[PDB]
Design a protein around this ligand. Structure first.
Ligand SMILES: [Cu+2]
Ligand SMILES: [Cu+2]
Ligand SMILES: [Zn+2]
Ligand SMILES: [Zn+2]
Lengths: 153, 153
C-alpha cells in the first residue's frame, strides 16, 4: 500500500478524516486531514495496537509498540512506533493535521494498516512528566474519537 | 496476524460483530459472529478492496480481486478472493455467521486486513444469474452495513 485512510468517530461529535501516503517503501509517511468538535489546544495523537472497536476506543488496547520501548515524542529515538505526539485545535475546535514520520510505515515490520488511530482528551507529555504513567501513555487521558486504518485507492 | 475483527454499521438498523482466526500461516481462516436488523433470508457477504468508509459503504469500492478473476461463490475455483457468498437471517432478523475459507488470508497477497467487510440488501447469485452483472457483483444490491477489518488481540 502507498495510500491509507481513517474515519475518526466519538462523542461531541468529535469527527475527522485522516489521510496517509508513502511514495517509497523505506520512505517517510505523510499524515494529513482535519478534526472538528475539539477543545482549543493540544490533543494526544497515537496509533494503538489493535484495530478493534467492539466496545469503542478502549478495545484498541495500548500504543503500537512492536520493539517494547518506552513512550516518547515523535522526534525521540526512545519511542513507540505509534507515538505521533500532539495535534492542535483552534478557537473553533478544528485541528488541521500535517505530519511527516520516518518510524511508522504502510508496509513491513512497522505497518499501521489494520490498527486504531486515536485522538485524546488532554495533551501528550511526551514522557517528560516525571510520573510512572508519563513513559507509558504520556498522561493524554480519555479517547475522544478513533477509527481503523484501512487501505486507500 | 493470527486474529482479526470487524464492527458492521450502516445508515439503517443493520449492525454486527465478525471475528477471524488463522491458526497456521497459509492455513484456513474461521469467520464467526452475529448480524441483527436484517430481512429474513440470504444476504451477500464480501470483502471489498478499500478500507475507506469516508462516505459510508460506497467508498469501499469493488470486490477484493488481486488475481483478476470473475465473481463466483466461495466453493468455486473461479471467484474473487473477497467472495464469501451469503449469510442467512431468521424471522427475528439475526444471522449467526460460521464460515471456513482457504482463499482469504490474514497475511500476504490474499491479506484482508485493512479492507472492508460488507453485508448486502439482496442475495448473491454466485455468478449464476445469466446477466453481465452476475459475474461482477452477483446482483446483491445496496450495502446495508460495513466496517474495516482490524488486527485483534
Ligand atoms: Cu493514544
Ligand atoms: Cu459486496
Ligand atoms: Zn506511546
Ligand atoms: Zn466478487
Amino acid at each position: 500500500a502507498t495510500k491509507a485512510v481513517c474515519v475518526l468517530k466519538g462523542d461531541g461529535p468529535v469527527q475527522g478524516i485522516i489521510n496517509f501516503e508513502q511514495k517509497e517503501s523505506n520512505g517517510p509517511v505523510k499524515v494529513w486531514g482535519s478534526i472538528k468538535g475539539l477543545t482549543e489546544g493540544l490533543h494526544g495523537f497515537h496509533v494503538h495496537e489493535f484495530g478493534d472497536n467492539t466496545a469503542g476506543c478502549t478495545s484498541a488496547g495500548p500504543h503500537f509498540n512492536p520493539l517494547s520501548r518506552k513512550h516518547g515524542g515523535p522526534k525521540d529515538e526512545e519511542r513507540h512506533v505509534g507515538d505521533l505526539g500532539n495535534v492542535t485545535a483552534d478557537k473553533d475546535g478544528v485541528a488541521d493535521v500535517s505530519i511527516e514520520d520516518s518510524v511508522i510505515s504502510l508496509s513491513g515490520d512497522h505497518c499501521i494498516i489494520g490498527r486504531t488511530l486515536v485522538v485524546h482528551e488532554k495533551a501528550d507529555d511526551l514522557g517528560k512528566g516525571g510520573n510512572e504513567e508519563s513513559t507509558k501513555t504520556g498522561n493524554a487521558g480519555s479517547r475522544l474519537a478513533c477509527g481503523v486504518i484501512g487501505i486507500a485507492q
